[PDB]
Short mmCIF file of C-alpha atoms in Angstrom, two decimals:
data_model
loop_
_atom_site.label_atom_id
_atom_site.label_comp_id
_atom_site.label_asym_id
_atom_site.label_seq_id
_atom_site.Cartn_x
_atom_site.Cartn_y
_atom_site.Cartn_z
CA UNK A 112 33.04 6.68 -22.75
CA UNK A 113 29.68 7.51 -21.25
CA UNK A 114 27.98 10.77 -22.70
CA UNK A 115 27.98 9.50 -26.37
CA UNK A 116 27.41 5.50 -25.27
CA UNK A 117 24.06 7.53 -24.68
CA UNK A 118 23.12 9.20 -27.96
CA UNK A 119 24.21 5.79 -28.94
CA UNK A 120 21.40 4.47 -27.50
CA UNK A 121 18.18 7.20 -27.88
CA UNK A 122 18.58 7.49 -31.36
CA UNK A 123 14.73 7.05 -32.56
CA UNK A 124 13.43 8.39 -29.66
CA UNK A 125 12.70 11.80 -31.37
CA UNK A 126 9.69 10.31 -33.05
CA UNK A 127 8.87 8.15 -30.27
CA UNK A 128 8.72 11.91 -27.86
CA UNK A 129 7.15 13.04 -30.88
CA UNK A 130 4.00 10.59 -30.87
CA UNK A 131 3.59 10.84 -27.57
CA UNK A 132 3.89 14.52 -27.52
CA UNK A 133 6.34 15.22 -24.78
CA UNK A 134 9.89 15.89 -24.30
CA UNK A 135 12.39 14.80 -21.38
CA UNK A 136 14.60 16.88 -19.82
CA UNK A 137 16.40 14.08 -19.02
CA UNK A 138 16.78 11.40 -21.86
CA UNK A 139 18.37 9.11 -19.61
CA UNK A 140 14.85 8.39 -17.76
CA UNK A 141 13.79 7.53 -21.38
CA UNK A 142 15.93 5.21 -22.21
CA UNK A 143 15.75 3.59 -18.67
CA UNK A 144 11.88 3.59 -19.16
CA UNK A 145 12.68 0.94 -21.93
CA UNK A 146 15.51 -0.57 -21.20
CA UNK A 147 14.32 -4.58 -20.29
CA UNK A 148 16.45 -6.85 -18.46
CA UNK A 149 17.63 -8.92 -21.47
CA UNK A 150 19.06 -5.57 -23.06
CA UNK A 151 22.85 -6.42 -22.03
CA UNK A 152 24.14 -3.58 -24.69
CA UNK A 153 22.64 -0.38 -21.62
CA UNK A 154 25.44 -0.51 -18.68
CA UNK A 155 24.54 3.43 -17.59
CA UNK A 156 21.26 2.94 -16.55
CA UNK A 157 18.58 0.19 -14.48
CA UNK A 158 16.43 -1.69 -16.85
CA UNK A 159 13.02 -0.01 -16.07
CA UNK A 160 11.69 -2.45 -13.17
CA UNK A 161 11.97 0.10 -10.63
CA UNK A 162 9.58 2.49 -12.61
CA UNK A 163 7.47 0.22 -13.76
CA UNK A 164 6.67 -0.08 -9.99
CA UNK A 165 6.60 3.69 -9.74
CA UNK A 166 4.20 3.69 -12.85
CA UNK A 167 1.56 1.37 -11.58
CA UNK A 168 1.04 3.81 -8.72
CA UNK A 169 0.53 6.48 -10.42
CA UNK A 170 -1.51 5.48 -13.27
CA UNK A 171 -3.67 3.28 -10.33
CA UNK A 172 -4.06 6.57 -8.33
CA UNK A 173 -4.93 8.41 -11.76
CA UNK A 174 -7.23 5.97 -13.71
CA UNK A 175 -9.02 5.80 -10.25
CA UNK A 176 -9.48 9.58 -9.45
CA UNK A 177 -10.59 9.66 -12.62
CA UNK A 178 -13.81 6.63 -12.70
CA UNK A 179 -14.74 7.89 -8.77
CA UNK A 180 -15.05 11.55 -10.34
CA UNK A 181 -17.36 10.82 -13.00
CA UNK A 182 -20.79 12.05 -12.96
CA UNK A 183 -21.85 8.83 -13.93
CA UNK A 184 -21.07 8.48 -9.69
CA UNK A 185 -21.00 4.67 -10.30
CA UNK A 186 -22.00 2.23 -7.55
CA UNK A 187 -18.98 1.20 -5.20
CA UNK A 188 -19.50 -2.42 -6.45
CA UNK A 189 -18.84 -1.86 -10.64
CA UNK A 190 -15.99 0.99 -9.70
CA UNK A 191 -13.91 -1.94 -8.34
CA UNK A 192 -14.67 -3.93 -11.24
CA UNK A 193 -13.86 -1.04 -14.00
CA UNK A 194 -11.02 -0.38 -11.79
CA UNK A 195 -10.11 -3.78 -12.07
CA UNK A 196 -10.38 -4.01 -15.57
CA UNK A 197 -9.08 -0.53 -16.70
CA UNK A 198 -5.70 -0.74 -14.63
CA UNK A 199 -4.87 -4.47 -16.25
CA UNK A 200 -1.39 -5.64 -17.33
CA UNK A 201 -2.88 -6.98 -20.42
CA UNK A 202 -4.41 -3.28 -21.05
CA UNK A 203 -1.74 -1.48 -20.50
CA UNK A 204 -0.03 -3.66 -23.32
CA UNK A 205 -2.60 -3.31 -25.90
CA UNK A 206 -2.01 0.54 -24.97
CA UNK A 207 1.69 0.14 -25.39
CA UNK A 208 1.30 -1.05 -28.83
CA UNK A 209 -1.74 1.42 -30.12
CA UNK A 210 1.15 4.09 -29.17
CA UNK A 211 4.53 1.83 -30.82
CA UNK A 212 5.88 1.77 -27.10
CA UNK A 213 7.39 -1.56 -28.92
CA UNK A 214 9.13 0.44 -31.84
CA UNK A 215 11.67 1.75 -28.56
CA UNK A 216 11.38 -1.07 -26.77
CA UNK A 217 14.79 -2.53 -25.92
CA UNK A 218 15.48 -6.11 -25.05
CA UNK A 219 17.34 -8.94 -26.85
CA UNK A 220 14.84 -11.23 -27.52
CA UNK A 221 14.06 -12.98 -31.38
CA UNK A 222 11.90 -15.31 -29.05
CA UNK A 223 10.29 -12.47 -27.47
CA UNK A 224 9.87 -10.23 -30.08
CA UNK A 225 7.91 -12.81 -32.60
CA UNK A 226 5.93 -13.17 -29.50
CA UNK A 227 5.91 -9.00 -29.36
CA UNK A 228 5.07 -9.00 -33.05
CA UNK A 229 2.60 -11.92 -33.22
CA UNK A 230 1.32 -9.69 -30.39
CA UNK A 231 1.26 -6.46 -32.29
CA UNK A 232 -0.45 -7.18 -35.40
CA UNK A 233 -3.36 -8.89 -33.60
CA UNK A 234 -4.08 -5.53 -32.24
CA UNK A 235 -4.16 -3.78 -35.22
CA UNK A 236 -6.36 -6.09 -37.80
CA UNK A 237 -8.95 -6.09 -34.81
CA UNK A 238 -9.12 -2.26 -35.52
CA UNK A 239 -11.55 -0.82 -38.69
CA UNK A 240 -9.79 -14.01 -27.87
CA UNK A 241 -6.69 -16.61 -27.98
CA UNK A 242 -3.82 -14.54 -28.71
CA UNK A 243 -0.92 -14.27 -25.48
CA UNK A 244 0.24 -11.36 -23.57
CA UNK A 245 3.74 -10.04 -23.23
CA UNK A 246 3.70 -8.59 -20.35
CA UNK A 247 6.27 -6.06 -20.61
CA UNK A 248 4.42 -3.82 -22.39
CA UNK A 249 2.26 -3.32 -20.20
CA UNK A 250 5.23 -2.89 -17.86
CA UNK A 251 7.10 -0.09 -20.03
CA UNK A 252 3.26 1.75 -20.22
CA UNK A 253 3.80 2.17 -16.65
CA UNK A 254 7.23 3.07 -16.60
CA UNK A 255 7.15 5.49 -18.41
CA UNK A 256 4.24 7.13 -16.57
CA UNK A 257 7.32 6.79 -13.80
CA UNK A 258 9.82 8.46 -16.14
CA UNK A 259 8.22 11.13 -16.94
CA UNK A 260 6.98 11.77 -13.38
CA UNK A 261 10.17 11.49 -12.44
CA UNK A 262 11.26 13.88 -15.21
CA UNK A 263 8.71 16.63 -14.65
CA UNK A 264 9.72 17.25 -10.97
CA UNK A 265 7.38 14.18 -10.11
CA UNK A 266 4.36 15.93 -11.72
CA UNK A 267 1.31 14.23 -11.38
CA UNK A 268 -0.41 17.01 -13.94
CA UNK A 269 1.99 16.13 -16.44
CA UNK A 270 1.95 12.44 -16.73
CA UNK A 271 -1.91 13.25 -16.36
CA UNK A 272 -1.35 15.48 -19.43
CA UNK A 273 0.39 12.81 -21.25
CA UNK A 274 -1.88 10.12 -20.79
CA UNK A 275 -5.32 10.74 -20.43
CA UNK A 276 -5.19 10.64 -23.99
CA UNK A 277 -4.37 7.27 -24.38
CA UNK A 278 -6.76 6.00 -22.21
CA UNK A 279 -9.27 8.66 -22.54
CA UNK A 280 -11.41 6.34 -24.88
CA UNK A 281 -10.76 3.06 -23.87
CA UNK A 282 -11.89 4.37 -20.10
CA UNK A 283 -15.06 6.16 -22.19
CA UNK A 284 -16.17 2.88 -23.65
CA UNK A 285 -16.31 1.01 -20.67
CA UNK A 286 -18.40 2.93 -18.89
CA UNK A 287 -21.07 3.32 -21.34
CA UNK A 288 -21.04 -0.27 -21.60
CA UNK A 289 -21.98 -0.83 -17.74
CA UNK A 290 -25.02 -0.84 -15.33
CA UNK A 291 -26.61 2.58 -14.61
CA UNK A 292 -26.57 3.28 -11.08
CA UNK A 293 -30.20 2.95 -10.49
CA UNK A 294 -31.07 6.07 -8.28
CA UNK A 295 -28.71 8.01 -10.23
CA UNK A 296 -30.15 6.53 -13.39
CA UNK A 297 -32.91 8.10 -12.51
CA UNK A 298 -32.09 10.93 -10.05
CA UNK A 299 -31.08 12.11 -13.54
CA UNK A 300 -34.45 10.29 -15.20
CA UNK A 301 -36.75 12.67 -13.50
CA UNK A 302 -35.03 15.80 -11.71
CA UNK A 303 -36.76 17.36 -8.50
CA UNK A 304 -39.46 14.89 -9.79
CA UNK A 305 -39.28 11.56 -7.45
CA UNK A 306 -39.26 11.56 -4.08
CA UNK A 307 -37.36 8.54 -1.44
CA UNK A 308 -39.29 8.22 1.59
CA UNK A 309 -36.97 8.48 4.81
CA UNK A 310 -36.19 4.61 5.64
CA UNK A 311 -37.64 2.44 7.72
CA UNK A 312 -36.48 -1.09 8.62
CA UNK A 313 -38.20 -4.51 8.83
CA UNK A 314 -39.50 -7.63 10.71
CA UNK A 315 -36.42 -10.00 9.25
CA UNK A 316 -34.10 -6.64 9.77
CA UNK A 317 -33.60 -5.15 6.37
CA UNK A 318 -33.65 -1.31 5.48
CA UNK A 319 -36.79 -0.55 3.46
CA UNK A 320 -37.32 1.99 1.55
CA UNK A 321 -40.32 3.68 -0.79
CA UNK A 322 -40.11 6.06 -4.06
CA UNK A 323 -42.99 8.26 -5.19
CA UNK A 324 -43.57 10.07 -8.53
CA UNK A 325 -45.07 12.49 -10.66
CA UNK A 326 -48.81 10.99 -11.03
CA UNK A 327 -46.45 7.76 -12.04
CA UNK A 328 -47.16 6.78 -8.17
CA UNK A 329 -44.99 5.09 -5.91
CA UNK A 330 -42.18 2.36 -5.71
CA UNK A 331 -41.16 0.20 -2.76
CA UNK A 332 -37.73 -1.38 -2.35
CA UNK A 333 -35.70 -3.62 0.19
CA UNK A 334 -32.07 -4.76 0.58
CA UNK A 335 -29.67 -5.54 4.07
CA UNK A 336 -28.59 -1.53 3.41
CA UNK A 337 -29.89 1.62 2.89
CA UNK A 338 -27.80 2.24 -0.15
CA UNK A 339 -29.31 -0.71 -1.90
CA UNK A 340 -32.99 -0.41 -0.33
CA UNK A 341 -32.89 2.59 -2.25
CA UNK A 342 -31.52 1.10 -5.89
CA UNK A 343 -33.40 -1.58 -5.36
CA UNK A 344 -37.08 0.94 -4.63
CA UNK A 345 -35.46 2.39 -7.78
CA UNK A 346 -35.54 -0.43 -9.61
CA UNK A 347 -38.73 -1.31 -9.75
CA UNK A 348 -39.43 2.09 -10.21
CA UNK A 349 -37.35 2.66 -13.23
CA UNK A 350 -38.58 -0.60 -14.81
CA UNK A 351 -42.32 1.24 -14.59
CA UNK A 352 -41.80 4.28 -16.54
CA UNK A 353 -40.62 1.73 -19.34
CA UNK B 93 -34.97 17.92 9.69
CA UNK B 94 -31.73 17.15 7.99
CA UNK B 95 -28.97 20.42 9.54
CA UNK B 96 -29.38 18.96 13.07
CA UNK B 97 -30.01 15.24 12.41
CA UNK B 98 -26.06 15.69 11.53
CA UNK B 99 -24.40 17.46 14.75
CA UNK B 100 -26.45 14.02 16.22
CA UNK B 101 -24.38 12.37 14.22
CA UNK B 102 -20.70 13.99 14.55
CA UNK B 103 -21.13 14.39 18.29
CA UNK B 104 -17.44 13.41 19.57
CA UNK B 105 -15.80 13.62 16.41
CA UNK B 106 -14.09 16.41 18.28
CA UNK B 107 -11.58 14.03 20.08
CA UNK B 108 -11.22 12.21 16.83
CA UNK B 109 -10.49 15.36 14.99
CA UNK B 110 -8.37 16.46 17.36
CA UNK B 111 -6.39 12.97 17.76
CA UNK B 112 -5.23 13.05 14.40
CA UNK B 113 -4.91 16.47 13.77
CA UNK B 114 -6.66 17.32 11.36
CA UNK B 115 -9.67 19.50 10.67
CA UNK B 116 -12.88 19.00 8.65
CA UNK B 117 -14.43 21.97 6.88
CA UNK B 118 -17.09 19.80 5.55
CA UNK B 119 -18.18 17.84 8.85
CA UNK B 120 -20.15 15.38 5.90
CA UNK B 121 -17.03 14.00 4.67
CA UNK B 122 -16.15 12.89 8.12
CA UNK B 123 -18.78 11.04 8.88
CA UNK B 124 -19.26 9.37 5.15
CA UNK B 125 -15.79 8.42 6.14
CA UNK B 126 -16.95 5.97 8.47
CA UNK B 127 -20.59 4.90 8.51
CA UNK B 128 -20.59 1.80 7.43
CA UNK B 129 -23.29 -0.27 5.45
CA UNK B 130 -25.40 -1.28 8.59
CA UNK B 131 -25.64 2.01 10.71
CA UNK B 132 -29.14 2.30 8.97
CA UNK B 133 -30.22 5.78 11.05
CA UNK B 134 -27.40 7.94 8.46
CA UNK B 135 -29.89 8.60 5.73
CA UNK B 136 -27.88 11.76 5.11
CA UNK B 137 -24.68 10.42 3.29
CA UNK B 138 -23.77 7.59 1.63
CA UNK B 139 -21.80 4.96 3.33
CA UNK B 140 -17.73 5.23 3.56
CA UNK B 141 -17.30 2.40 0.46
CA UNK B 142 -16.99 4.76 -2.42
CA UNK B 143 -14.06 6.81 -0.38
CA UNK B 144 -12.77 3.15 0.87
CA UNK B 145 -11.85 2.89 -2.97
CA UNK B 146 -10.97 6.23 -3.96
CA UNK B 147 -8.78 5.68 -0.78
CA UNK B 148 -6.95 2.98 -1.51
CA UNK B 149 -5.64 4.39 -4.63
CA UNK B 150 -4.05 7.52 -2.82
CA UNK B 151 -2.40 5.59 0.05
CA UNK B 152 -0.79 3.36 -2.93
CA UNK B 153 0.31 5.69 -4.59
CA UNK B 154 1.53 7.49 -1.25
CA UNK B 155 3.27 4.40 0.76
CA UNK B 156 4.86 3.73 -2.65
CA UNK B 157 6.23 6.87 -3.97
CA UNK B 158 7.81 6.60 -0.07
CA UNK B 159 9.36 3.29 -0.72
CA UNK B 160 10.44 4.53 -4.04
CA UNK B 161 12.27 7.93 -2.94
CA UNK B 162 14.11 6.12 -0.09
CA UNK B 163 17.55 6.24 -0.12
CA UNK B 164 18.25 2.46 0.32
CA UNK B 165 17.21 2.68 -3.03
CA UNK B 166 15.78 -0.60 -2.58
CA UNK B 167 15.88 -3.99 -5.57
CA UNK B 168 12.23 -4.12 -6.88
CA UNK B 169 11.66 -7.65 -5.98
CA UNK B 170 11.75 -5.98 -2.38
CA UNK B 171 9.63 -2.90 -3.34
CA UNK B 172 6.88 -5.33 -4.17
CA UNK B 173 7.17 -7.34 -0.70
CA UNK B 174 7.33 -4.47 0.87
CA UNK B 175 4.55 -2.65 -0.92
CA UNK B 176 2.80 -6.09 -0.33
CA UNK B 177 3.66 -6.29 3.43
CA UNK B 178 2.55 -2.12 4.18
CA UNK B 179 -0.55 -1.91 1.93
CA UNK B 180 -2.41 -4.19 3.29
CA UNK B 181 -5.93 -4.39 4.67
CA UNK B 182 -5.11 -5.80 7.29
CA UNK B 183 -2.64 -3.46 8.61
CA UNK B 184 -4.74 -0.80 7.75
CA UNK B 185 -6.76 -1.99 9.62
CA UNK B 186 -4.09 -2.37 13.07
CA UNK B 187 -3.34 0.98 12.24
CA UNK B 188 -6.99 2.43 12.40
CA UNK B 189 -7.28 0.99 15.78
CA UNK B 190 -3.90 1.75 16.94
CA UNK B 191 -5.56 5.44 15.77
CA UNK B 192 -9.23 5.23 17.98
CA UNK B 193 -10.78 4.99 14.17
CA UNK B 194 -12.77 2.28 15.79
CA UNK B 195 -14.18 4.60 18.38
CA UNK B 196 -15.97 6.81 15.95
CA UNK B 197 -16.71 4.03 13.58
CA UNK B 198 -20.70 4.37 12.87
CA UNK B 199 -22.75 0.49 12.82
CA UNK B 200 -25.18 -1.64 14.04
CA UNK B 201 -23.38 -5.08 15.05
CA UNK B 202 -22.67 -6.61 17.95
CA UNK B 203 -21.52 -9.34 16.33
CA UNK B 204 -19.32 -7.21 14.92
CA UNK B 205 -18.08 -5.01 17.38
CA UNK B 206 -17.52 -8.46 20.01
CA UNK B 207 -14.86 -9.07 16.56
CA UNK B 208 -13.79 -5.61 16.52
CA UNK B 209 -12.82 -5.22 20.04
CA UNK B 210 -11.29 -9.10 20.86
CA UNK B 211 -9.33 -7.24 18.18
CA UNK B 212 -8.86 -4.05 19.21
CA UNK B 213 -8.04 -5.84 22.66
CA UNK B 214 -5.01 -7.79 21.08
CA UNK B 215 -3.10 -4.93 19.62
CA UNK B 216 -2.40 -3.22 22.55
CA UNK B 217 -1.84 -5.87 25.01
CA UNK B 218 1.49 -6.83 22.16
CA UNK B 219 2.38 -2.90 22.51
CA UNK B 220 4.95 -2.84 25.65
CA UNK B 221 -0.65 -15.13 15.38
CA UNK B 222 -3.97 -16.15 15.29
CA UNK B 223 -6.60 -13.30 15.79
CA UNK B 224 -9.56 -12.61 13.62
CA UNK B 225 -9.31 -9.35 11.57
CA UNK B 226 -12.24 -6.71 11.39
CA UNK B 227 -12.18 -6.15 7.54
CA UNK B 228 -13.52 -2.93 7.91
CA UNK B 229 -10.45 -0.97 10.16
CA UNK B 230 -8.70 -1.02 7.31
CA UNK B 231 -11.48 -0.27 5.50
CA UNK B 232 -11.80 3.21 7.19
CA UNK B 233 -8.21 3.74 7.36
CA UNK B 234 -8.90 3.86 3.79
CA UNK B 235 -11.96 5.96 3.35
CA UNK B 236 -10.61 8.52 5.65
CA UNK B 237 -7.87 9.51 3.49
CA UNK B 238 -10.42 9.42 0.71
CA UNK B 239 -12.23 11.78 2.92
CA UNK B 240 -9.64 14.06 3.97
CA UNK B 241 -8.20 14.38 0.16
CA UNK B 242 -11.82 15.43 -0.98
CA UNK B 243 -11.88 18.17 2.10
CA UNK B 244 -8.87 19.61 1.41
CA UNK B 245 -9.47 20.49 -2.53
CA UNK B 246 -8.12 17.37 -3.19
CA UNK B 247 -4.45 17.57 -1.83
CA UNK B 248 -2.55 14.94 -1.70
CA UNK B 249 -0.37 16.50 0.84
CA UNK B 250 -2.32 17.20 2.98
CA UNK B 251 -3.77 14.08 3.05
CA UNK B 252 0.04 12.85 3.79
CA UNK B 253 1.04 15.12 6.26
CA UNK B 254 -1.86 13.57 8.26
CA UNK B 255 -1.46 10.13 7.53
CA UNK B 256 2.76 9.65 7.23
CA UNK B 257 2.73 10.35 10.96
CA UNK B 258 0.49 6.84 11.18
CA UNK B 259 2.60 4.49 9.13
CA UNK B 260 6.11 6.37 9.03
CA UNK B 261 7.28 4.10 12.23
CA UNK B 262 6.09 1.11 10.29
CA UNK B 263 7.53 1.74 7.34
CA UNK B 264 10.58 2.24 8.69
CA UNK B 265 10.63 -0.52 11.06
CA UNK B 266 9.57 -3.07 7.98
CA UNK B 267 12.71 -1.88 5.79
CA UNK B 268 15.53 -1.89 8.37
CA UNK B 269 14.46 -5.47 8.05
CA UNK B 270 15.36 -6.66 4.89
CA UNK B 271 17.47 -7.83 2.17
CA UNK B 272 20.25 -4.68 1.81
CA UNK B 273 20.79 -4.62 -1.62
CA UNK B 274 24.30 -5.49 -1.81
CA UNK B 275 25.85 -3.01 -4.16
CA UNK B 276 23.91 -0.33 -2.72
CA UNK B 277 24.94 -2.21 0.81
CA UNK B 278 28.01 -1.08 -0.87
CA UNK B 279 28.05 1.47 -2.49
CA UNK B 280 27.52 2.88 0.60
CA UNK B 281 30.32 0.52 2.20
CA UNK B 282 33.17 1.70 0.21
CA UNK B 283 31.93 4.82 -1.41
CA UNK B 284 34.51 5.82 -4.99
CA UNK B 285 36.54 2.91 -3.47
CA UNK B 286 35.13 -0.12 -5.24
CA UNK B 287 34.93 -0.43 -9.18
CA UNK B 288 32.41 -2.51 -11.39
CA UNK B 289 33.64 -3.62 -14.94
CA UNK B 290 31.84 -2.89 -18.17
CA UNK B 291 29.81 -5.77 -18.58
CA UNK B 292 30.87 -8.87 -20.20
CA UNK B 293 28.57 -11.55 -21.35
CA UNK B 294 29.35 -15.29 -21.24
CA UNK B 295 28.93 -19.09 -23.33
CA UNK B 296 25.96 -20.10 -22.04
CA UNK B 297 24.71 -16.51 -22.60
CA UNK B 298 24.53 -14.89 -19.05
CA UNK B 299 25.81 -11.46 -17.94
CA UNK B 300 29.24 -11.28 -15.98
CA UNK B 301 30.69 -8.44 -14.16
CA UNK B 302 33.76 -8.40 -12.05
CA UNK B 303 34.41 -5.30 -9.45
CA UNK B 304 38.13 -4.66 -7.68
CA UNK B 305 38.39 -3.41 -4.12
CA UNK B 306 40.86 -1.08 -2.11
CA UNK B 307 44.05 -3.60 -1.96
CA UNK B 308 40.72 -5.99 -0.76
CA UNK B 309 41.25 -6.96 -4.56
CA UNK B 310 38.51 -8.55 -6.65
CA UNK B 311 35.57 -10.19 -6.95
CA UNK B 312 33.18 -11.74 -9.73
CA UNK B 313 29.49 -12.48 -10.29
CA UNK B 314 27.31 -13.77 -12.89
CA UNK B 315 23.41 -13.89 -13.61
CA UNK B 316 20.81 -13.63 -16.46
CA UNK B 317 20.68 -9.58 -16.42
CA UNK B 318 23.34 -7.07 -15.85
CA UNK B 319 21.70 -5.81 -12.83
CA UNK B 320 21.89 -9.14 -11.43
CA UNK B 321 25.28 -9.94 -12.54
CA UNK B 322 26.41 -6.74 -10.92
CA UNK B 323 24.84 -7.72 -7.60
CA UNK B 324 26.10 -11.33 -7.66
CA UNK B 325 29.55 -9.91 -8.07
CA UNK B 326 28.68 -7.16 -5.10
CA UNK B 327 27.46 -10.33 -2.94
CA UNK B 328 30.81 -12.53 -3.08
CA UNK B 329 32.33 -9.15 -2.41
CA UNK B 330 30.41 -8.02 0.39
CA UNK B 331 30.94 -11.39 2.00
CA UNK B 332 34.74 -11.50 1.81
CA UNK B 333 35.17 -8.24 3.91
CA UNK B 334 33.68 -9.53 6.69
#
């Protein structure tokens, strides 16, 4: 008998909707958010796969809107690291865990779960290296994103809502921890108060380019672009007024 | 004088607008979209790599909540072939010139261009193998839709009621082509009129199933997860009524 089978199997999840601070509609795309392969107890549902799919999507198309939007306006070159390093399988565990994804996490699995926990506790120690990965957490951090997508009417918003917060600082300190975009660095630096000459380009056929400022005179860059003749007249420039 | 220097620059987008039905409101984003890194005479925008990224991200998460939604309700080892097969630079990039993007596209290569077109060339001579691929068709395919998004307030839909119209034939023509995933395949075969067991596991600690037929009587499968098992038992199924 089906409709009970179910409570059966979401019992816990109240704190887990709790911690997370939502609450599905549907408590079926919960448990299927967490349901692993190896969990041959759940016959009413798929085991998560095909949201974990789902999930990367989103949280790719989200974690990305976000770094291209920031002020910061990063170079083209470190967005595709951050993105690279933000949306990570091996992030999205360490997520997972911070937020006890693994307290609802259902498998069968002694092997995998010593693995799980060896994998848990790491995380937390490391919190006032050679240590593995299991992947599915990272997996069931994007399923769920799927879930409750799914669950909200496919609401981007929503699973925005959800889980900026759990990135929100991770994404914060990577940035910090990056190169400043040179003209921007210093766009920024001094206002309305340095100048980029229009550019001109050169005997071996580069772009050049040439920065004046405020009685702190004048700065001359080139690179194979514009783009970079520019950073690169910045550059030199910012090193200067240092 | 910067206002003019730019209807220099857009001159023809017209057709292009017009081709693909869609447009601009800012002309800037447009042209962003696709001067590349060597058309050193833009000094007015940056090139289209920063919407290339930003790009990417949105047709992900676009092709894929397609493949997702479809009714095959396609196995995820497929979704990530498929996903693999349609995202995919370098179809991006046969679709951009299947599209004129290449027509519009702003540079300053020869070298390039005697690449772009031997490619563009190919394409359409196949349209009634080894060929060198212009990274940067795809690259534009990309940047558009980064473009487009950030004209239209940011809307996703709009960005897909332009851009579906592009890939919707290949989709569709890459999924007809696959793997039917046999209960689904049958599901859909025999609609209330086949019947899966509960699940039953086994001695050397696999998942069984067994599913019964319309006086077609009964077949049985086995594999390491219950989604497997099921489709194992589906398979030898499927195959007997033919």
């Amino acid at each position: 008998d089906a409709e009970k089978t179910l409570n059966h199997l979401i019992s816990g999840f109240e704190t887990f909707e709790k911690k997370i601070n939502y609450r599905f509609k549907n408590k079926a795309y919960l448990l299927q958010a967490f349901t692993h392969a190896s969990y041959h107890y759940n016959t009413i549902t798929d085991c998560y796969q095909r949201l974990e799919f789902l999930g990367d999507a989103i949280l790719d198309y989200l974690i990305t809107k976000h770094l291209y939007e920031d002020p910061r306006q990063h170079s083209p070159g470190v967005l595709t690291d951050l993105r690279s390093a933000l949306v990570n399988n091996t992030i999205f565990a360490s997520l997972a865990v911070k937020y006890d994804y693994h307290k609802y996490f259902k498998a069968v699995s002694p092997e995998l779960f010593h693995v799980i926990d060896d994998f848990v506790k790491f995380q937390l120690e490391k919190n006032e290296e050679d240590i593995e990965v299991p992947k599915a957490m990272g997996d069931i951090f994007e399923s769920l994103a799927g879930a409750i997508y799914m669950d909200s009417g496919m609401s981007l918003e929503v699973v925005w809502q959800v889980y900026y917060p759990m990135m929100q600082p991770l994404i914060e300190k990577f940035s910090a921890n990056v190169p400043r975009s040179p003209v921007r660095e210093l766009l920024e630096m001094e206002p309305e108060t340095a100048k980029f000459s229009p550019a001109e380009r050169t005997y071996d056929g580069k772009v050049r380019v040439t920065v004046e400022v405020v009685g702190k005179g004048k700065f001359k860059g080139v690179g194979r672009s514009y783009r970079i003749a520019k950073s690169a007249a910045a550059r030199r420039a910012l090193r200067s007024l240092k």
